[PDB]
């Protein structure tokens, strides 16, 4: 089951990426984050591939809910650190 993560609705993306990059219980190298928005997949951010990072960089700078991102919604995060993609249950 997804590891419950708690951020305030105003937070920005950079914020979540940093939690993942610095947590001593995690600290993933370069995590790729996606989520399902309105029944479709939305790639929030991914650095490894430039074609993608170039169009997803503005999001790091965007507000969390300006991403249509609403709570209880499982985030999909993949990183070298993760054997398999792990799901994070976002917390409002």
């Amino acid at each position: 089951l997804p590891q419950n993560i708690q951020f305030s609705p105003s937070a920005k993306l950079q914020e979540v990426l940093d939690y993942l990059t610095n947590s001593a219980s995690l600290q993933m190298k370069s995590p790729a984050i996606t989520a399902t928005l309105e029944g479709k997949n939305r790639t929030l951010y991914m650095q490894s591939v430039t074609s993608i990072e170039e169009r997803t960089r503005p999001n790091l700078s965007k507000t969390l809910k300006e991403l249509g991102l609403v709570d209880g919604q499982e985030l999909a995060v993949a990183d070298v650190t993760t054997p398999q993609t792990v799901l994070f249950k976002l917390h409002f």
Binding site: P31, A32, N41, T43
Partner: protein, 160 residues
């Protein structure tokens, strides 16, 4: 879909862990669609040095159980690729294993340009010329890459 399909979870994983040679470049028309993308291979050595080859990838919902569908969109004179774009890469068909990744396929694809395989080719003529006359093949590659005929067959230019 309600949540992320098993296929979407895996592809996100694989795409994020690519360690491609300088000769390969991957691109996505839509950052949100990780199931469709292009790979561009510009060899810098071997018979196809200076050429530019584009492949399309289409990841199905059966991935990683089912290997993704790959085709060459650049006409090329090669034993393992036919005029229709079909690519004979072992790990793409009978040798595919769920443990393999896009990075696996990409390296497989680039190897075809470094060491074309005369065994089980899709273009037998190209195959023959490869084993029989090493160099004639080399000339055919050059001409066809610049844009030209080989037999009654015209190969469109594909230099980078």
């Amino acid at each position: 879909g309600s949540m992320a399909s098993a296929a979407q979870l895996r592809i996100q994983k694989d795409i994020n862990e690519l360690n491609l040679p300088k000769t390969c470049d991957i691109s996505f028309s839509d950052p949100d669609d990780l199931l469709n993308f292009k790979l561009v291979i510009c060899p810098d050595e071997g018979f196809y040095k200076s050429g530019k080859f584009v492949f399309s990838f289409k990841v199905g919902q059966g991935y990683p159980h089912d290997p993704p569908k790959v085709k060459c969109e650049t006409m090329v004179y090669h034993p393992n690729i036919d005029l229709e774009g079909n690519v004979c890469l072992n790990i793409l068909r009978e040798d595919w294993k769920p443990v393999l990744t896009i990075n696996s396929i990409i390296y497989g694809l680039q190897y075809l340009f470094l060491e074309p395989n005369p065994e089980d080719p899709l273009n037998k003529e190209a195959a023959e010329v490869l084993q029989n006359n090493r160099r004639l093949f080399e000339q055919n590659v050059q001409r066809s890459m610049r844009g030209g005929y080989i037999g009654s067959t015209y190969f469109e230019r594909c230099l980078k």
